[PDB]
């Protein structure tokens, strides 16, 4: 004979106590504490309000329910002959929400990464991790990634839910792995005299590779002297040749290096 | 936080609740049922009466406490600011008392006797048997005596207690062993003529042995004829001879007999 009255936190709880005509006295109680005895306010809490005092039902109201309001409320009333009690157990449901999540982390390829997602809620919320680029789901507060590769990098989303009608409140974290440059594309030019030409290197790196060009032994300085100018991009570096020059012909090597490694390839310029 | 108020069954229980001046409301509660709210009677039981309504203490009384009154009584009261509770747990003690005990028993020596002492009480009382004359104790509701002897006869006391502040209510039973008479002492007289003499026998028996005197063949009748008079006691019987007589000289036999046996010894009267 213990009924369950579950409410979502912050809402209004209404406690009705239905009685017959022949009731001598009636009151609602907080655990063992009296709130209202008939028209008598016992509780000094301004949230406890009296809704209905009909000789057929005796109903009160609790405004702004908190976690401290969880308890056993009884409605002890009396007839001319025998006493009575009808009890109701108040349960507060806190909707699930993420309270702490890992900061945007950066690691080197082949590293070991641990992501934590702390979420609170009544009942116990279910924390679930997810990778945006690739669909992988792990039902756990923490997620570890051992010897991560470049493709596994991206945004990692945490979602939590306690099954309530409330929204899950998912949040995302971006993981960026560092990898050394590997030269994917190399172009060589063998052009005739009079026409412009260009050499290029494609090496993708994080942090973006610092590209170095080498003419045989020496390296280029991107100066107007010798009529050469290099254009640097995040994933490429084009070596541009204005007009032509007799000396410009020869072996060339580019070098792409970041903090994690280096790479180099040799291309030529012929006629 | 929880006090114990143990009462013996049938007495008066009084529940005081001491409060300061700044109390908006006050009430006593039996479990979750309101008994008295201020000056307002909630309980329909005429045994609950309100003794004191001082703004300093709020005390009620329960007349004729029963086992059904055992419970947790709380005093929920209110100040202008916060509620309060001071609780009291009612405990009923049934005092130990003997309801059945053995009647005064009689047995023959070497017999087997069983004495039972049935005692009631909550909690379960501890029954202990005891021998009054000689210190012997048996911690058991029943006491058995194998091959009962003469010295073991006497009063056997039963005592029971439940540890309460109540009295032990001890009772006694008398055990009387019957034993046949065994003649312990016999005296013969060899007196001269003119002087008085006496014969006696000592045989203790229960029930007291009926002593018989025999002069040679015949038996004495304690008559003034022949000048003889016998004095019989519980443990002895003296055969008294006043002055002398020629016929008085000769063999004599005494006999002590009860319900369990007889005994006889031969003494003489010489010159
Ligand atoms: C019954 O009344 C007591 C009064 O102390 C409540 O206890 C406090 O309630 C408030 C608000 O809910 C909390 O902030 C406090 O932490 C609680 N404890 C104390 C020591 O003040 C109790 O919650 C009430 N019970 C119900 C079911 O309403
Ligand atoms: C009330 O809630 C408790 C705790 O979840 C549960 O054990 C019980 O079965 C519930 N009763 C009802 C009637 O829902
Ligand atoms: C709760 O009651 C207050 C008081 O009337 C009202 O303003 C509020 O809108 C109510 N909220 C809900 C969710 O019932
Ligand atoms: C390229 O050739 C044009 C035409 O002959 C000339 O005007 C210009 O100066 C040359 N520039 C370079 C960098 O050689
Ligand atoms: C330059 O390239 C040519 C042709 O590929 C090669 O023969 C020569 O060894 C390279 N190096 C130098 C310094 O000329
Ligand atoms: C009441 O009795 C229990 C049981 O022994 C004890 O733990 C508690 O301290 C007692 N309370 C008081 C106020 O004596
Ligand atoms: C106990 O309660 C009875 C109830 O009738 C009352 O008459 C009596 O005065 C009370 N006090 C004592 C000491 O018996
Ligand atoms: C107290 O409550 C119990 C249980 O409901 C009930 O049996 C008893 O009669 C009530 N009154 C007293 C004085 O114990």
XYZ file of C-alpha atoms and ligand atoms in Angstrom:
668
model
C 0.000 0.000 0.000
C 2.794 2.414 -0.960
C 2.134 4.268 -4.194
C 4.777 5.918 -6.367
C 4.496 9.577 -7.388
C 7.492 10.376 -9.595
C 7.949 13.972 -10.765
C 10.560 15.672 -12.894
C 12.696 18.129 -10.942
C 11.472 21.721 -10.816
C 7.824 20.940 -11.610
C 4.767 21.043 -9.343
C 3.787 18.068 -7.187
C 0.111 17.715 -6.262
C -0.971 15.427 -3.421
C -4.686 14.591 -3.391
C -6.265 12.604 -0.539
C -9.813 11.450 -1.299
C -12.167 10.909 1.650
C -15.798 10.056 2.352
C -18.281 12.378 4.059
C -17.686 11.040 7.605
C -14.112 12.176 8.308
C -13.400 13.773 11.688
C -9.947 15.193 10.864
C -7.422 15.063 8.029
C -3.803 16.088 7.487
C -0.848 15.627 5.146
C 2.580 14.792 6.542
C 6.204 15.038 5.444
C 7.722 11.779 6.657
C 6.796 12.391 10.302
C 6.361 16.199 9.982
C 2.943 17.859 9.731
C 2.409 20.275 6.825
C -1.300 21.172 6.958
C -3.838 20.010 9.542
C -7.161 20.997 8.045
C -6.859 24.744 7.474
C -3.852 25.010 9.813
C -0.503 25.740 8.178
C 2.147 23.837 10.107
C 4.988 23.942 7.578
C 6.987 27.168 7.392
C 7.960 26.294 3.809
C 6.295 28.790 1.418
C 6.307 26.132 -1.329
C 3.603 24.038 0.382
C 0.191 25.255 -0.797
C -3.321 23.965 -0.073
C -5.317 23.209 -3.229
C -8.618 21.596 -2.188
C -10.177 21.254 1.276
C -13.560 19.799 0.252
C -15.091 17.332 2.763
C -14.577 14.831 -0.072
C -10.928 15.442 -1.011
C -8.039 17.152 0.789
C -5.380 18.191 -1.735
C -2.179 20.215 -1.331
C 0.557 21.334 -3.729
C 4.364 21.548 -3.638
C 5.885 24.237 -5.861
C 9.424 23.829 -7.224
C 10.249 20.239 -6.270
C 13.827 19.598 -5.176
C 15.898 16.502 -4.497
C 15.352 17.078 -0.773
C 11.592 16.662 -1.258
C 11.965 12.925 -1.921
C 10.230 11.218 0.976
C 7.195 9.320 2.215
C 4.118 11.551 2.436
C 1.187 10.117 4.381
C -2.394 11.386 4.712
C -3.433 10.457 8.250
C -7.144 11.040 8.837
C -9.740 9.946 11.386
C -13.352 8.831 11.378
C -15.649 8.597 14.389
C -14.489 4.991 14.870
C -10.975 4.274 13.575
C -7.942 6.127 12.183
C -6.678 5.892 8.619
C -3.536 6.460 6.558
C -3.000 6.608 2.793
C 0.666 6.966 1.872
C 2.438 8.221 -1.258
C 6.182 8.100 -1.968
C 7.550 11.170 -3.744
C 10.292 10.494 -6.303
C 12.204 13.262 -8.097
C 13.710 12.573 -11.524
C 16.662 14.770 -12.493
C 16.920 14.840 -16.315
C 20.261 13.660 -17.655
C 22.887 16.279 -18.491
C 26.613 16.321 -19.249
C 28.518 18.121 -16.490
C 32.121 17.478 -17.529
C 33.721 16.380 -20.800
C 37.291 16.231 -22.045
C 38.900 19.262 -23.648
C 39.860 19.224 -27.352
C 42.950 17.017 -27.212
C 45.907 16.750 -29.587
C 48.127 13.656 -29.705
C 50.858 12.173 -31.870
C 49.969 9.268 -34.149
C 50.373 5.990 -32.337
C 49.585 7.619 -29.002
C 47.133 6.539 -26.321
C 44.090 8.734 -25.660
C 41.484 8.555 -22.891
C 38.259 10.575 -23.077
C 35.952 10.913 -20.072
C 32.321 12.077 -20.133
C 30.853 12.747 -16.683
C 27.053 12.978 -16.694
C 24.581 13.298 -13.821
C 20.957 12.268 -13.519
C 18.267 10.391 -11.593
C 17.930 7.551 -12.521
C 21.535 6.633 -13.369
C 22.118 8.053 -16.872
C 23.636 5.954 -19.646
C 26.778 7.571 -21.069
C 27.501 6.643 -24.692
C 30.475 7.690 -26.818
C 30.367 8.039 -30.602
C 32.724 8.964 -33.433
C 31.260 11.350 -35.999
C 33.243 10.359 -39.100
C 32.982 6.603 -38.441
C 30.037 5.011 -36.676
C 31.349 3.326 -33.539
C 29.450 3.246 -30.246
C 30.790 2.412 -26.782
C 28.454 2.274 -23.773
C 30.855 3.642 -21.180
C 31.680 6.811 -19.253
C 35.292 6.591 -20.468
C 36.718 5.728 -23.885
C 40.350 4.800 -24.547
C 42.023 4.834 -27.969
C 45.277 2.855 -28.178
C 47.784 3.506 -30.992
C 45.339 5.710 -32.877
C 45.852 6.148 -36.611
C 45.290 9.243 -38.709
C 41.869 8.152 -39.978
C 40.529 7.566 -36.449
C 41.014 11.275 -35.677
C 38.014 13.584 -35.786
C 35.160 14.691 -33.569
C 34.041 12.392 -30.752
C 30.521 12.889 -29.400
C 29.223 11.940 -25.961
C 25.499 11.367 -25.429
C 23.714 10.508 -22.182
C 20.101 9.691 -21.369
C 18.098 8.499 -18.363
C 15.125 7.408 -20.480
C 13.025 10.425 -19.448
C 11.052 12.466 -21.980
C 13.812 15.099 -21.699
C 16.467 15.592 -24.354
C 19.744 13.632 -24.079
C 22.006 16.737 -24.115
C 24.848 15.417 -26.261
C 28.166 17.258 -26.580
C 31.134 16.895 -28.931
C 34.936 16.985 -28.664
C 37.401 17.228 -31.570
C 40.444 14.918 -31.526
C 43.364 15.857 -33.805
C 46.244 13.382 -34.232
C 49.695 14.568 -35.321
C 51.392 12.687 -38.161
C 54.709 13.286 -39.966
C 54.602 14.271 -43.649
C 54.521 11.617 -46.364
C 54.980 13.071 -49.851
C 51.979 11.888 -51.881
C 52.467 13.754 -55.172
C 55.543 15.006 -57.028
C 55.502 16.712 -60.431
C 58.473 17.216 -62.743
C 58.606 19.551 -65.726
C 60.704 19.327 -68.883
C 59.816 22.500 -70.745
C 61.378 24.269 -73.691
C 63.033 27.664 -73.495
C 60.751 30.706 -73.451
C 57.894 29.135 -71.451
C 57.156 29.239 -67.732
C 57.193 26.075 -65.632
C 56.494 24.879 -62.105
C 57.428 22.037 -59.770
C 55.320 21.000 -56.801
C 55.288 18.744 -53.751
C 52.226 17.415 -51.926
C 52.838 16.324 -48.332
C 49.999 16.502 -45.818
C 51.060 16.829 -42.191
C 49.716 17.963 -38.828
C 51.034 20.398 -37.777
C 51.344 21.393 -41.454
C 54.732 20.463 -42.855
C 57.366 23.162 -43.288
C 58.385 22.747 -46.930
C 61.988 23.217 -48.068
C 63.141 23.283 -51.697
C 66.649 22.292 -52.804
C 68.257 23.068 -56.167
C 70.928 20.379 -56.564
C 72.950 21.265 -53.464
C 71.740 24.796 -52.711
C 68.262 25.767 -51.519
C 65.962 28.429 -52.942
C 65.241 31.697 -51.126
C 62.135 32.818 -53.095
C 63.879 36.044 -54.105
C 63.578 37.993 -57.337
C 67.209 37.040 -57.968
C 67.481 34.089 -60.390
C 63.796 34.588 -61.281
C 62.302 31.966 -58.957
C 59.450 32.200 -56.458
C 58.012 29.455 -54.237
C 54.363 29.368 -53.149
C 53.680 27.551 -49.876
C 50.372 25.898 -48.975
C 49.268 23.725 -46.070
C 49.397 20.552 -48.193
C 51.575 21.709 -51.110
C 54.457 23.965 -52.105
C 54.776 24.989 -55.757
C 58.176 26.053 -57.106
C 57.373 28.624 -59.793
C 59.653 29.628 -62.676
C 59.267 33.026 -64.334
C 60.134 33.116 -68.054
C 63.095 30.699 -68.487
C 66.736 30.671 -67.465
C 69.633 28.556 -68.693
C 70.833 27.875 -65.145
C 67.357 26.837 -63.933
C 67.816 23.411 -65.566
C 69.002 20.661 -63.234
C 68.085 18.365 -60.371
C 65.666 19.526 -57.684
C 64.630 18.085 -54.321
C 61.855 19.280 -52.015
C 61.795 18.546 -48.287
C 58.654 18.445 -46.147
C 59.235 18.216 -42.403
C 57.217 18.871 -39.270
C 57.929 18.041 -35.630
C 57.362 14.310 -36.204
C 59.406 13.532 -39.317
C 60.750 14.577 -42.686
C 60.380 13.564 -46.320
C 62.146 14.442 -49.559
C 61.811 13.721 -53.277
C 63.981 14.647 -56.268
C 62.503 15.947 -59.526
C 64.208 17.377 -62.594
C 63.754 20.234 -65.061
C 64.670 19.323 -68.645
C 64.232 20.638 -72.182
C 18.098 10.148 18.099
C 15.663 7.399 19.173
C 14.922 6.947 22.880
C 13.473 3.848 24.530
C 10.522 4.071 26.946
C 9.889 0.559 28.264
C 6.808 0.005 30.433
C 5.446 -3.037 32.227
C 2.127 -4.223 30.822
C -0.990 -2.673 32.337
C 0.679 0.434 33.791
C 0.373 4.071 32.708
C 2.711 5.465 30.052
C 3.279 9.234 29.955
C 4.994 10.872 26.973
C 6.403 14.349 27.618
C 7.638 16.626 24.821
C 9.598 19.624 26.093
C 9.535 22.740 23.896
C 10.620 26.369 23.986
C 8.221 29.315 23.980
C 8.497 29.956 20.212
C 6.403 27.010 19.013
C 3.598 27.574 16.507
C 2.106 24.073 16.756
C 2.762 20.762 18.510
C 1.416 17.222 18.265
C 2.059 13.643 19.361
C 1.831 10.784 16.889
C 1.467 7.041 17.244
C 3.381 5.619 14.254
C 1.852 7.715 11.425
C -1.467 8.358 13.204
C -2.201 11.630 14.977
C -3.383 11.089 18.557
C -3.654 14.636 19.966
C -3.045 17.873 18.035
C -2.796 20.734 20.499
C -6.114 20.810 22.338
C -7.750 18.745 19.553
C -8.530 15.052 20.032
C -7.706 13.027 16.932
C -7.563 9.532 18.448
C -10.888 7.854 19.205
C -9.223 5.689 21.873
C -10.371 6.825 25.357
C -7.102 5.594 26.907
C -5.101 8.500 25.419
C -5.434 11.582 27.642
C -3.579 14.910 27.469
C -1.876 15.813 30.748
C 0.060 19.043 30.069
C -0.442 21.792 27.458
C 2.183 24.240 28.728
C 3.948 26.302 26.016
C 6.996 24.614 27.560
C 5.999 20.932 27.497
C 3.300 18.978 25.647
C 2.730 15.693 27.485
C 0.097 12.986 27.023
C -0.763 9.771 28.861
C -1.722 6.241 27.801
C -3.724 4.274 30.367
C -3.492 0.469 30.511
C -0.609 -0.201 28.120
C -0.918 -3.330 25.992
C 1.419 -5.166 23.646
C -0.381 -3.493 20.741
C 0.778 -0.105 22.034
C 4.414 -0.980 21.260
C 5.529 1.460 18.588
C 7.469 4.582 17.663
C 5.813 7.692 19.107
C 6.946 11.029 17.673
C 6.341 14.625 18.773
C 6.244 16.719 15.603
C 6.217 20.431 16.438
C 6.880 23.615 14.499
C 8.646 26.903 15.059
C 8.258 30.035 12.962
C 11.243 28.842 10.898
C 11.757 25.065 10.842
C 10.011 21.834 11.872
C 11.242 19.440 14.540
C 10.830 15.847 15.675
C 11.617 14.176 18.992
C 10.738 10.492 18.900
C 10.095 7.907 21.617
C 9.845 4.147 21.107
C 7.288 2.438 23.338
C 8.317 -1.017 24.573
C 6.019 -3.315 26.556
C 7.553 -5.697 29.101
C 5.502 -8.676 30.296
C 6.886 -9.421 33.788
C 7.921 -13.000 34.419
C 5.446 -15.008 36.473
C 4.890 -18.667 37.315
C 1.632 -20.033 35.900
C 2.115 -23.773 36.570
C 4.211 -25.595 39.167
C 4.165 -29.112 40.575
C 2.031 -30.028 43.570
C 3.696 -31.167 46.830
C 4.845 -34.662 45.847
C 5.622 -37.727 47.972
C 7.757 -40.639 46.744
C 9.497 -43.721 48.101
C 13.262 -43.543 48.585
C 15.184 -44.487 45.462
C 12.297 -43.313 43.285
C 12.199 -40.931 40.338
C 10.646 -37.462 40.645
C 10.017 -34.884 37.917
C 9.195 -31.274 38.810
C 8.019 -28.801 36.167
C 7.829 -25.009 36.471
C 5.917 -23.321 33.646
C 6.442 -19.552 33.559
C 5.198 -16.923 31.117
C 6.677 -13.610 30.061
C 7.904 -11.394 27.227
C 10.798 -11.705 26.681
C 11.137 -15.453 27.293
C 11.822 -15.772 31.045
C 14.641 -17.907 32.428
C 13.297 -20.625 34.736
C 15.693 -21.889 37.414
C 15.076 -24.645 39.956
C 16.656 -24.543 43.390
C 16.813 -26.704 46.521
C 16.230 -24.797 49.754
C 18.026 -26.956 52.333
C 20.998 -27.765 50.073
C 22.297 -25.488 47.341
C 21.508 -27.103 43.993
C 20.411 -25.251 40.850
C 19.201 -26.577 37.494
C 18.699 -24.091 34.649
C 15.690 -25.794 33.108
C 11.900 -25.559 33.089
C 11.748 -29.154 34.379
C 13.853 -30.844 37.066
C 14.250 -34.618 37.389
C 15.638 -36.431 40.445
C 16.887 -40.002 39.970
C 17.216 -42.382 42.941
C 15.848 -39.821 45.369
C 17.382 -40.060 48.832
C 16.377 -39.217 52.393
C 18.656 -36.185 52.653
C 17.336 -34.733 49.391
C 13.818 -34.320 50.817
C 12.711 -30.786 51.593
C 11.530 -27.698 49.750
C 12.440 -27.114 46.100
C 12.018 -23.534 44.891
C 11.392 -22.337 41.341
C 12.380 -18.810 40.315
C 11.913 -17.131 36.935
C 12.982 -13.729 35.642
C 12.929 -11.818 32.365
C 15.496 -9.261 33.550
C 12.880 -6.502 33.895
C 12.715 -4.209 36.924
C 9.792 -6.411 38.021
C 9.874 -8.883 40.909
C 10.986 -12.505 40.378
C 7.742 -14.046 41.740
C 9.364 -17.182 43.131
C 7.364 -20.151 44.398
C 8.270 -23.182 46.492
C 7.294 -26.857 46.422
C 7.849 -29.365 49.227
C 9.240 -32.784 48.294
C 8.960 -35.383 51.068
C 10.661 -38.726 50.593
C 9.309 -41.673 52.524
C 11.938 -43.981 53.961
C 11.426 -47.069 56.130
C 12.691 -46.946 59.715
C 16.258 -48.053 60.368
C 16.949 -48.697 64.048
C 20.010 -46.576 64.858
C 20.330 -46.888 68.649
C 19.313 -49.574 71.148
C 20.038 -49.509 74.885
C 19.751 -52.376 77.361
C 19.753 -52.069 81.141
C 21.306 -54.358 83.750
C 20.168 -52.827 87.038
C 19.865 -54.230 90.542
C 16.597 -54.784 92.377
C 15.024 -51.663 93.860
C 16.418 -49.324 91.186
C 14.723 -47.990 88.061
C 15.764 -48.863 84.511
C 14.732 -48.021 80.962
C 14.987 -49.492 77.470
C 14.785 -47.472 74.266
C 14.893 -47.802 70.486
C 15.882 -45.118 67.964
C 14.439 -45.518 64.455
C 13.685 -42.453 62.324
C 10.995 -42.838 59.664
C 8.635 -40.809 57.481
C 5.713 -41.175 58.087
C 6.841 -41.595 61.706
C 7.236 -45.265 62.532
C 4.669 -46.917 64.786
C 6.840 -48.376 67.547
C 5.856 -51.638 69.239
C 7.398 -53.100 72.394
C 7.392 -56.817 73.215
C 8.150 -58.375 76.604
C 9.462 -61.832 75.680
C 6.427 -63.046 73.729
C 3.679 -60.652 74.822
C 3.557 -56.949 73.989
C 3.258 -54.053 76.404
C 0.098 -51.949 76.581
C 1.513 -49.030 78.633
C -0.960 -49.764 81.424
C -0.489 -49.318 85.156
C -0.786 -53.102 85.475
C 2.652 -54.771 85.736
C 4.137 -51.320 86.452
C 5.320 -50.499 82.928
C 4.812 -47.432 80.745
C 6.180 -46.830 77.241
C 6.784 -43.342 75.846
C 6.739 -43.166 72.043
C 8.261 -40.237 70.152
C 8.659 -39.339 66.485
C 12.153 -40.868 66.384
C 12.269 -42.911 69.619
C 10.235 -45.013 72.036
C 11.416 -45.385 75.636
C 10.300 -48.434 77.629
C 10.291 -47.183 81.217
C 10.381 -49.401 84.306
C 9.387 -47.848 87.633
C 10.885 -49.542 90.716
C 11.376 -53.289 89.964
C 9.446 -56.490 89.374
C 10.427 -60.161 89.306
C 8.489 -60.653 86.065
C 10.147 -57.641 84.391
C 13.447 -59.506 83.943
C 13.806 -61.249 80.598
C 14.208 -60.741 76.868
C 12.694 -57.720 75.114
C 12.167 -56.780 71.465
C 11.152 -53.435 69.965
C 9.622 -53.011 66.508
C 9.479 -49.802 64.454
C 7.355 -49.991 61.306
C 5.837 -47.571 58.806
C 4.232 -47.986 55.376
C 7.526 -48.904 53.667
C 9.031 -51.453 56.050
C 9.595 -52.702 59.569
C 12.561 -53.217 61.870
C 13.228 -55.051 65.122
C 16.054 -55.363 67.649
C 16.491 -57.507 70.764
C 17.587 -56.070 74.115
C 17.601 -57.629 77.578
C 16.955 -56.578 81.179
C 19.402 -58.179 83.616
C 20.497 -57.931 87.249
C 10.620 17.365 5.590
O 11.081 18.544 6.304
C 12.511 18.647 6.432
C 12.788 19.894 7.245
O 14.143 19.963 7.669
C 13.166 18.672 5.051
O 14.580 18.654 5.216
C 15.208 19.715 4.467
O 14.521 20.031 3.231
C 15.140 21.078 2.464
C 14.257 21.315 1.259
O 13.768 20.093 0.723
C 16.563 20.675 2.088
O 17.183 21.742 1.380
C 17.360 20.358 3.346
O 18.663 19.901 3.003
C 16.646 19.286 4.165
N 17.387 18.982 5.381
C 17.623 19.860 6.368
C 18.402 19.333 7.536
O 17.231 21.023 6.324
C 12.746 17.447 4.252
O 13.284 17.502 2.936
C 11.226 17.346 4.173
N 10.851 16.134 3.462
C 10.009 16.096 2.426
C 9.759 14.738 1.846
O 9.447 17.101 2.001
C 8.084 2.230 -6.569
O 9.491 2.449 -6.790
C 10.359 1.429 -6.272
C 11.772 1.860 -6.593
O 11.967 2.011 -7.993
C 10.000 0.072 -6.875
O 10.805 -0.931 -6.268
C 8.525 -0.231 -6.652
O 8.176 -1.446 -7.305
C 7.667 0.906 -7.202
N 6.256 0.635 -6.976
C 5.302 0.940 -7.862
C 3.897 0.589 -7.464
O 5.560 1.474 -8.936
C 3.404 25.555 -10.762
O 2.590 26.450 -9.973
C 2.877 27.846 -10.145
C 1.952 28.591 -9.210
O 0.652 28.731 -9.765
C 2.691 28.243 -11.609
O 3.089 29.600 -11.780
C 3.522 27.345 -12.519
O 3.281 27.664 -13.888
C 3.222 25.867 -12.249
N 4.074 25.015 -13.067
C 3.732 23.780 -13.460
C 4.741 23.050 -14.301
O 2.657 23.274 -13.155
C 60.258 37.850 -69.351
O 60.260 38.136 -70.748
C 59.692 39.413 -71.065
C 59.619 39.502 -72.575
O 60.870 39.220 -73.185
C 60.538 40.515 -70.431
O 59.942 41.779 -70.697
C 60.643 40.300 -68.925
O 61.560 41.233 -68.363
C 61.117 38.882 -68.608
N 61.094 38.642 -67.172
C 61.947 37.817 -66.552
C 61.776 37.684 -65.067
O 62.816 37.202 -67.162
C 71.348 15.851 -62.317
O 70.495 15.077 -63.177
C 71.211 14.370 -64.202
C 70.177 13.686 -65.068
O 69.167 13.063 -64.286
C 72.211 13.395 -63.579
O 72.979 12.790 -64.613
C 73.137 14.118 -62.608
O 73.967 13.183 -61.926
C 72.324 14.922 -61.595
N 73.199 15.656 -60.692
C 74.054 16.611 -61.080
C 74.866 17.245 -59.989
O 74.171 16.952 -62.255
C 17.499 3.304 22.434
O 17.860 1.907 22.384
C 18.805 1.556 21.361
C 18.984 0.051 21.421
O 19.928 -0.341 22.410
C 20.104 2.340 21.542
O 20.964 2.036 20.449
C 19.825 3.839 21.582
O 21.045 4.519 21.861
C 18.775 4.160 22.655
N 18.476 5.588 22.670
C 18.502 6.303 23.797
C 18.180 7.766 23.666
O 18.771 5.790 24.880
C -3.231 5.505 35.842
O -4.362 5.493 34.948
C -5.630 5.340 35.607
C -6.680 5.253 34.519
O -7.995 5.124 35.041
C -5.853 6.501 36.573
O -7.095 6.340 37.248
C -4.710 6.558 37.577
O -4.866 7.695 38.418
C -3.376 6.653 36.843
N -2.264 6.695 37.783
C -1.889 5.676 38.572
C -0.717 5.942 39.469
O -2.467 4.591 38.565
C -1.042 2.853 17.869
O -0.863 2.242 16.585
C -1.062 0.819 16.564
C -0.802 0.364 15.143
O -1.625 1.034 14.197
C -2.465 0.461 17.052
O -2.561 -0.956 17.127
C -2.711 1.059 18.431
O -4.044 0.800 18.862
C -2.461 2.561 18.386
N -2.715 3.178 19.679
C -1.969 2.976 20.771
C -2.390 3.732 21.996
O -1.002 2.224 20.773
